[PDB]
Amino acid sequence: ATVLLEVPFSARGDRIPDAVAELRTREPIRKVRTITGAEAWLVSSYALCTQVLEDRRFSMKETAAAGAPRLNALTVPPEVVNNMGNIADAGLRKAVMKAITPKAPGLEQFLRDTANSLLDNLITEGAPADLRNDFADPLATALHCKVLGIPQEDGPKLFRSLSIAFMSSADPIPAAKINWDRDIEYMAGILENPNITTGLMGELSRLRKDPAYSHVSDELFATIGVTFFGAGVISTGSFLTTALISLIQRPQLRNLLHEKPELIPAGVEELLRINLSFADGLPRLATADIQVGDVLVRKGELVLVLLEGANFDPEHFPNPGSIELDRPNPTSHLAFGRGQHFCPGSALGRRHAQIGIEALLKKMPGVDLAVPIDQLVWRTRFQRRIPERLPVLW
């Protein structure tokens, strides 16, 4: 006898387990057990993943309900799970979206300057260098301080919350509350700080004092700062890091992008498609009985949308494991999700990776791993897959 198949399958972000293709072919929706002991439906084909993400009856908000089957423990207050809904209801959606576009004057030049400075410092210190801790993550942190309008020097402390904040735990995490409350207090202070007049926090600070937003809560304003910093930094840092691994392991592609940097955006789109940064399927709770493939999902059940299931589906992306810059459907991947909860930071995430890679290939065209790839240490029980260190030489 064996127990029910458990998720997640592997914390490794450098290879996809054979089990994914097996499931997709034989049972593209099937029952699994999560780390909490709850059962869930794991969805692994492009067609069924898209169906679930495009049907709001599969609800993000309702995953926070007391007594629901859980993927993992909440690390934020339950009301915050409906973060974008709260922002929308407060009439703040357009303003937030405008503030986080990569098109702000000077933002791209800031990114390039920052990337180049980080790389120069690594070159000065000499190989080996750690491209996660001393390149990808600081670049993400710097970008988000700039986008938020907050001091660069405050980035490191806010960043240190994230190795706990984005845990995927079977049980509640006491440290997550301590850090959350402290970070909320910080953002509340920012809203009252006369020095803060640019970026997302500068804009929220002004809207907060405008009559049309007088009954929007201070808690919501602070929460927007905390969640956008955290989600943005962890997502961009983790994606860039694992994308660099995929690039390093493809010297032919690395050379092509070095020689023809105009191809970098198409390269980054393919790196998004094959990215294994999300450690768990995206969770939704059924609010009705809904047929998905051969399964009638019942009201109250948990569904997990496996992004790499969709993104490596050969029925949608032929030769799915290969990076091919000339696909006819290049942005149709699910790396940023789909539907109601599509990533609001997609443009900024793309630009972060494009500029980081462009800078790295120019400064370190001979970049390569400094340890055998199996020596990378993959973070466990976390909402992202990432190597603890990424040692390179050049």
Ligand X SMILES: Oc1ccc(-c2n[nH]cc2Oc2ccccc2)c(O)c1
- Applying CB under 6 A, the span of 211-219, 288-296, 332-340, 382-390 interacting with ligand HEM comes to 332-340
Q: Given the structure tokens 């496996």, which residue do they identify? A: 306
Peptide bond into 8 cis (omega under 30): yes
Whether residue 61 contacts residue 40, with contact meaning beta carbons closer than 8 Å, is answered with no
> Which are the contacts of 221, defined by CB distance < 8 A and separation ≥ 6?
187, 188, 191, 204, 208
Shortest spacing between CB 131 and ligand HEM, in angstroms? 16
344 binds, among ligand X, ligand HEM, none (CB under 5 to 8 A by kind): ligand HEM
Residue 144, annotated ligand binder?
Answer: no
Stretch that binds ligand HEM, among 212-220, 287-295, 334-342, 382-390 (CB under 6 A): 334-342
CB-based contact 84:341 (threshold 8 Å) = yes
| Partners of 30 in beta bridges | 42
Positive or negative: CA dihedral 122, 353, 312, 170:
positive
Q: Is 80 in the site for ligand X (CB under 6 A)?
A: yes
CB closer to ligand X out of 5 and 73: 73
Task: Tell whether residue 236 is a contact of ligand HEM (CB under 6 A).
Answer: yes
Query: C-alpha dihedral over 69, 72, 76, 77, to 10 degrees?
Result: 20
SS3 category, 391: strand
Residue 92's binding partner among ligand X, ligand HEM, none (Cβ under 5 to 8 angstroms by kind) is none
Q: Establish if 227 lies at the interface with ligand X (CB under 6 A).
A: yes
Draw the binding track, 135-174, toward ligand X (x: CB under 6 A; -: no contact): --------------------------x---xx--------
What are the percentages of helix, strand and coil residues in the chain, rounded to 5? 50, 10, 40
Q: Do 42 and 7 contact (CB within 8 A), yes or no?
A: yes
Q: How far is CA 246 from the centre of its chain?
A: 17
Burial class of residue 109, CB neighbours in 10 A (0-12, 13-18, 19+): exposed
The answer to whether the annotation marks 94 as part of a ligand binding site is no
The answer to the question of whether 145 is labelled as a binding residue is no
Task: Check the annotation: does 214 bind a ligand.
Answer: no
State yes or no: 299 annotated in a binding site. yes
Q: Which of 55, 62, 137, 183 binds ligand X (CB under 6 A)?
A: 183
Q: Which is nearer to ligand HEM, 193 or 346 (CB)?
A: 346
335 binds ligand HEM (CB under 6 A): yes
Choice between 43 and 234, CB closer to ligand X: 234
Residue ranges in contact with ligand X by CB under 6 A:
75-76, 80-81, 83, 161, 165-166, 176, 180, 183, 226-227, 230-231
Binding residues for substrate, as ranges, are 75, 83-84, 235, 299, 383
Interaction site with ligand HEM (CB under 6 A): 60, 83-84, 100, 227-228, 231-232, 235-236, 239, 277, 282, 335-337, 341, 343-345, 348-349
